[PDB]
Amino acid sequence: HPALRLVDPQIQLAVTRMVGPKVYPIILRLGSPLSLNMARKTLNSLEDKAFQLTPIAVQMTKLATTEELPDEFVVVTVK
Amino acid sequence: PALRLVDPQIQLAVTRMENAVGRDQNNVGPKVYPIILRLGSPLSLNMARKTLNSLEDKAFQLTPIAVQMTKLATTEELPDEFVVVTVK
Ligand SMILES: CCCCCCCC
């Protein structure tokens, strides 16, 4: 019943292990939902530094027709 | 759940198409960030290329990809710029 969902092309997957860094579109077969946080060590004190997590809102159109699928991509599956 | 550290073979690519003001920020390239999983429900990853190009229905060649992820225990193991993927 989970229909394939296409992640918009500002979020892609770089796979160096198969042939150099290659960006690949992302398909999601969501079983459980999924969030996406950007982490940087920019909460600088006088001595330490902390991590701030700014969530990234990823737009996910669900796939209408399988003809829309690209020639090549990666399928991330969440159970 | 526990924090796994995906090895540099697999990283997230994020492109800033514009700026905050909408300034056309093209020809600057993507930005690759190491991935870390707040992994609850387990996760899979398959490369896919189209095959069976006899027009009938388009088919895809799903070759699984080995996700080498290492459990992290210290903060200096954590880079100063990364991405956290959270699954329930
Ligand atoms: C919304 C992007 C999901 C990327 C998951 C990558 C896990 C190796």
Task: Look at residues A26, A59, A20 and name the one whose alpha carbon lies nearest to residue B12.
Answer: A26
Give the alpha-carbon dihedral of A26, A31, A32, A33, to 10 degrees. 40
B72 Cβ under 8 Å from any chain A Cβ:
no
CA B35 to each of CA A2, B49, B56: distance values in angstroms, whole numbers, following the listed order: 25, 24, 38
Domain containing B64 equals: 2-86
Q: What is the resolution of this structure in A?
A: 3.0
What is the domain count for chain B? 1
Optimal mutation site among B65, B68, B69, B72, interface A, most CBs of chain A within 10 A: B65
Pocket test for ligand 1, best of A34, A74, A75, A78 (most atoms within 8 A of CB): A34
Neighbours of A71 (CB within 10 A): 10
β-pairing, A49-55 vs A22-24, is unpaired
Burial-class residue B78 by CB neighbours within 10 Å (0-12, 13-18, 19+): middle
For A78, list phi and psi in degrees, rounded to 5.
Answer: -110, 125
Task: Look at residues B3, B18, B17 and name the one whose alpha carbon lies nearest to residue A12.
Answer: B17
Chain centroid to Cα A75, Å, comes to: 11
Check residue B76 and report its DSSP letter: G
Check residue B39 and report its DSSP letter: E
State both tokens at B78: 């954590």
Quick check: A15 and B46 in contact, CB under 8 A?
no
Neighbours of B2 (CB within 10 A): 9
β-pairing, A5-7 vs A60-62, is antiparallel
Quick check: B33 and B80 in contact, CB under 8 A?
no
Check residue A8 and report its DSSP letter: P
In the PDB record, what is the listed experimental method?
X-ray
